[PDB]
Design a protein around this ligand. Structure first.
Ligand SMILES: [Mg+2]
Ligand SMILES: [Mg+2]
Length: 227
């Protein structure tokens, strides 16, 4: 795709989220860069409204799959880059098992040479002392597969996957993800065969940062198609 050529080097990234979870209103700003040649993302997020009222790990998936590494032989399946620069809408329902849900609506597009992810997040039905509002999730992140299928009537894709957040007691908080993406612009976009994204993520803290924040290093490779 024409879109793919926008990702052959290092691309600056901005993330901006406004959220309301059970009436706790908050905002997050993030900055970093992506190098899709290596499936590589580095991002630092800051809660600009004070303390984040949900655990940072629960927002990782919401906070740019155009930075996935699609192997050359899978280039024709890369919807995300093909929608660029005009971008795509990315919507999800994230269902925390035995707890509340997030509904997210994001637009991912270029502003100049910078790839921007602007998100609105709404969370409802959370338990006041569940794992989310009670801040019982470990500050770490597991590796997951994102299963992608075409959504031809929307000129886009959908995805399903299961995120597992480690709980401080050693248990796991499941977050089921359902996802739909739709292109914003009028260029041709790629409608993929079934495949998945193999994701690994590492969370850290900036020792000099006293605002509430998260540093994310992530690697993503598309897979599941051999030819
Ligand atoms: Mg700012
Ligand atoms: Mg075929």
């Amino acid at each position: 795709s024409k879109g793919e050529e926008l990702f052959t080097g290092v691309v600056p990234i901005l993330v901006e989220l406004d959220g309301d979870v059970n009436g706790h209103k908050f905002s997050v700003s993030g900055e970093g860069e992506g190098d899709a040649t290596y499936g590589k993302l580095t991002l630092k997020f800051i809660c600009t409204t004070g303390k984040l009222p949900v655990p940072w790990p629960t927002l990782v998936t919401t906070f740019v799959q155009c930075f996935s590494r699609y192997p050359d032989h899978m280039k024709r399946h890369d919807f995300f880059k093909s929608a660029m620069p005009e971008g795509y809408v990315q919507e999800r329902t994230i269902s925390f098992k035995d707890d509340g849900n997030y509904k997210t609506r994001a637009e991912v597009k270029f502003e100049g040479d910078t790839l921007v992810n602007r998100i609105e997040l709404k969370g409802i039905d959370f338990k006041e002392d569940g794992n989310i509002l009670g801040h019982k999730l470990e500050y770490n992140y597991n590796s997951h597969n994102v299963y992608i299928t075409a959504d031809k009537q929307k000129n886009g894709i959908k995805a399903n996957f299961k995120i597992r957040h480690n709980i401080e007691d050693g248990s796991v908080q499941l977050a089921d993800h359902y996802q739909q993406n739709t292109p914003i612009g009028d260029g041709p976009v790629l409608l993929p065969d079934n495949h998945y994204l193999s994701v690994q993520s590492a969370l850290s803290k900036d020792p000099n940062e006293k605002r509430d924040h998260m540093v994310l290093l992530q690697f993503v490779t598309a897979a599941g198609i051999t030819h």
